[PDB]
Amino acid sequence: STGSATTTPIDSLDDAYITPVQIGTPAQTLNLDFDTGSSDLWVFSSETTASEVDGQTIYTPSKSTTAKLLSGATWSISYGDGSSSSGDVYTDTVSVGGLTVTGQAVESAKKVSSSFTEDSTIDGLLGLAFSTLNTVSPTQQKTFFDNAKASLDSPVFTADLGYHAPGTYNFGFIDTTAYTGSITYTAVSTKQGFWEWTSTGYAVGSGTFKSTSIDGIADTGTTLLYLPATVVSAYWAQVSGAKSSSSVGGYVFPCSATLPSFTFGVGSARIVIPGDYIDFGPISTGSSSCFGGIQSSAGIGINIFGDVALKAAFVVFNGATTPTLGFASK
Template sequence: MIPDSGSADTWLMSSTFQCLDRSHNQQDQIACNFGPSFTGNFSGGRIADEHMNISYGGGDSLNGDMGYEDITVAGITIPKQQMSLVTSASIRGNGIFSGILGLGMRGLTTSYTGSNPANDSPATAKEYAPLVETMSKKIAPLFSVAMSRDDNRSFISFGGVPPNVTTGEFATTPIRQMSMNGGPKHYIYYGIMPDNMKVSNTEANQTWPRPVGMLVDTGTTLNYFPADVAQAINDLFVPPAVYGGEGTFAVRCDAVPPRVEIGIGGKAIPINPSNLILPETKQSTPDGDYCISGVAANAGLSILGDAFLEELLVVFDVSDKKQMKFAQRTDKTAQ
């Protein structure tokens, strides 16, 4: 399962799910390319007249039954956690993961009453207690993430921070309340308001004194900024990155990235230079090897994704404090 702070629903693929293309035509399950599916039903019972309905920005969607299941993660068992078994999906997997471990807050849950997703609307939405809320009844109400390209240095910790990760000083900032569909503000995403953003290379530097609010999302690979900001950052690669379509930029894999700092809680948090070029995306061309830039142009919300989070220790505090903490790791010198 993918630990996803940008989603509050925990779900697994049911062994009987229908694989769909984006036009919702049925395909063989193998076309959806998920890992092992979940066999069986909800041990705590299915919830009658309630279902999950998620639509993602890329056009993919998921529908599923809702029910109660005992979930154990990191040695902590959460009895009768509400979750979903997916019955139909147009999303594509990577042949490994089988679902999402939703780490978002209550306002981001996507449960609806009734049995027909076509009738879903804000009026039929039904919030429920997600994993981070029910888990907080047994442990301290926080979790932390320490990502690295090195699997042996990548951790997620519930109720505290990983004991084998050392850091510099933390920067602390509140989680912002947000409004969805014009409704009242409440806690939905892990949204923060940065102090500023600074970008520089050996020849130029730029500062955005007050960037827009940004979401911190472990389930998103790239950083997504407004189009003009993303273009300006990608122009400062040496040689510059080029727009590749759908918001992404291509850059020579051996390019020199600019220095990008996000001001958070009065401290400058740099994006690790190695995260600004994704080597796993390398494509060889007659002009050389090109990779995807870690900075993309958004089509809506600005997001600090994995390309920002790597080599940081990030604490998601869902207690009454509702705050986030960021610190650079010192347990290994970042490359």
């Protein structure tokens, strides 16, 4: 089997991407944030504290003839950005782009943190990291991909995120028309539960490539590119007037600037992030100070190849017995 679904930016900055997901019988369609940095499929629901729902579409398990309470199971998650959610668990039928999994754990939120409430466009998350990170207790549950994998034509999914435009998540096949040149595959460590890999280096603009190993995670659920302070300083030094602002929480730059591109290495291959992908707009409405899309990972404890990086590539998440990651230009 295969599936293919369009993923759409939630706003004009590509702060996140939502993908429609069918849950239950009859289907209830929710727009979920596909997150290769976590492993829980959780939704706003009829059980979510009423004051914490503000415009989201909810899953109502009592209206699904295939929903079953997973007795005794609870979940609770905290994300790298400080947000969080928790609740109980149902199993139900879940379909993405024509690919159906029966008995998928659907984690129903009883509580969500303010950042989720305040984002009306995201109805929940669909985790695509390794199932070892799933938070369901006392019996850990499998991700949608893990459940689908054996049925897929090939045990893979691909992320093709757009810049200021829709893109595509495919399951079970590689669309050879969706990228240019070849896909370069690189090793993955699953030791921390992530799609963790090692970039071979970077360049700033038309500058020389610096060969250096940068361990990090491919994370569709993180907006920005978080890299070591040395790398990030080298990038922003090429933008007149850019500076790190402790008050704002990162590098800012004059909105009048033209940003240089940023290149990262994948083996001997190179992925070029155009400068415009690094612009996250005014820090507050009407400001001429703009927020940068490349930020320091210092104090995160891990480097994160988030959407800024991934949207410059066609990315293969290869879930073969020994997982790997592939990157192509597009």
